[PDB]
From a paper:
The lignin peroxidase isozyme H8 from the white-rot fungus Phanerochaete chrysosporium (LiPH8) demonstrates a high redox potential and can efficiently catalyze the oxidation of veratryl alcohol, as well as the degradation of recalcitrant lignin. However, native LiPH8 is unstable under acidic pH conditions. LiPs and VPs can directly oxidize nonphenolic lignin compounds through surface-active sites. Oxidation of high-redox-potential substrates, such as VA, is mainly catalyzed by the surface-active site Trp171 and its surrounding residues.
Only three predicted mutated sites, A16E, A55R/N156E, and H239E, were estimated to provide a stabilizing effect on the overall protein structure compared to native LiPH8 [based on their calculated Gibbs free energies depending on variable pH conditions]. The crystal structure of the variant A55R/N156E-H239E LiPH8 was solved; this variant showed both enhanced acidic pH stability and long-term catalytic activity. The crystal structure of the variant A55R/N156R-H239E LiPH8 showed the formation of salt bridges, as expected. The side-chains of A55R and N156E had two alternate locations on the electron density map. By contrast, rigid hydrogen bonding and a network of salt bridges were found between residues surrounding the introduced H239E mutation. The average RMSD at 300 K for the overall structure of native LiPH8 (RMSD: 4.81257 Å) was also higher than that measured for the A55R/N156E-H239E (RMSD: 3.19034 Å). We also found that a helix containing the active site Trp171 showed a significant decrease in fluctuation (yellow-colored helix). The combination mutations of A55R/N156E with H239E demonstrated a synergistic effect in both acid stability and long-term catalytic activity. Tm was assessed at different pH values and the variant proteins had increased Tm: native LiPH8 had a Tm of 49 °C, whereas the A55R/N156E-H239E variant LiPH8 had a Tm of 51.0 °C at pH 5. Herein, with the introduction of salt bridges at the appropriate positions, we recreated an active lignin peroxidase variant (LiPH8 variant A55R/N156E-H239E) from ancient ligninase (native LiPH8) that exhibited remarkable stability under extremely acidic conditions, such as MnPs, and still retained an exposed active site for lignin.
Numbering used by the authors: -1 to 343
The structure:
Amino acid sequence: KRATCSNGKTVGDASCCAWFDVLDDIQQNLFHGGQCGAEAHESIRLVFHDSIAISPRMEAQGKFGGGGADGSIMIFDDIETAFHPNIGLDEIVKLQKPFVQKHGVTPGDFIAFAGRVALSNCPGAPQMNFFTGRAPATQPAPDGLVPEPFHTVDQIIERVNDAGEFDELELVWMLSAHSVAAVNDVDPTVQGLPFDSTPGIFDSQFFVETQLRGTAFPGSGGNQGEVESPLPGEIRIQSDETIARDSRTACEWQSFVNNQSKLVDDFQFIFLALTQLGQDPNAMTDCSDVIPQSKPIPGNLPFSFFPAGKTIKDVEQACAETPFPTLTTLPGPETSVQRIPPPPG
Ligand code: HEB
Ligand SMILES: [Ca+2]
Ligand SMILES: [Ca+2]
């Protein structure tokens, strides 16, 4: 059957027991009592920037293409966090390092762990998986491997296809993370502008809101990779805006609107896949029973809605197969999306 940890919990594999002490430590000292706040969002982002930096095409040509989910972004933070796509990630890397040192775990395992635990904090999240077995990187990733907000949809599709054999529909899946996300470094005048009106809730509001006609910048204009957004305080990036309207991806983008089961099943899958880049999944240990049970979305709303002051008339419909769903609109005046201030220091 199962192993029993010193704290009296039971697990599928005895090696998983050490992660309960990591869990308690980060929930209290990294995530401010298990919150879906700035440190959680940064930890989710960090998983992608560690993991996607792998390139089988470069290896085939005799060039080191990076080791994927290997902890390189932490081990070699002075190198990798100075790459422009990794802007702002040295803060979370620095917050995470003490825990890795204290608990004697691999940097790559800890990054995957912290991302899973972060998502567990966000109502609506899938039940996140956690596998161990990522040896420390011995070489930093090359630059040019992490997508930018100003890149073409073509080059982003190509990049994820190379990194993980991900198709263009799976690209849409992994962008679900922007449902619990804010932007600190794109607008030099303001930090913490969310991508959707519910950055604390893993829902499909990101997929709704990116489909709306953009009307204004939330702060300054003229920032590379930024386009007009539909709501005060919400930011929109060019890549997301284009993927939402591109004939290859627009139908998948819309499919998440008012479809919670598809959202969570697809994201659960793709997040695990990201955390196993550069690894042999058969060689890894399943420690998924350490991750907290995800919480349902509270309250009494339909799963997807238009934000207040928006209706079907504000949607730029892009899926030729299926009209955009006629959602309910939240009552009241158009409200400003509140910023998520990044960690002090
Ligand atoms: C994980 C998963 C994921 C994925 C896949 C992604 C994908 C992406 N993305 Fe992301 N992001 C994210 C998650 C993510 N993401 C998050 C979580 C965030 C937030 C952070 C904070 O809040 O801090 C972001 C954020 C972000 C930002 C902001 C930053 C700064 O400012 O610093 C940007 C620009 C981006 C982009 C992007 C792109 C281009 C792509 C393509 C693919 N993003
Ligand atoms: Ca890496
Ligand atoms: Ca959200």
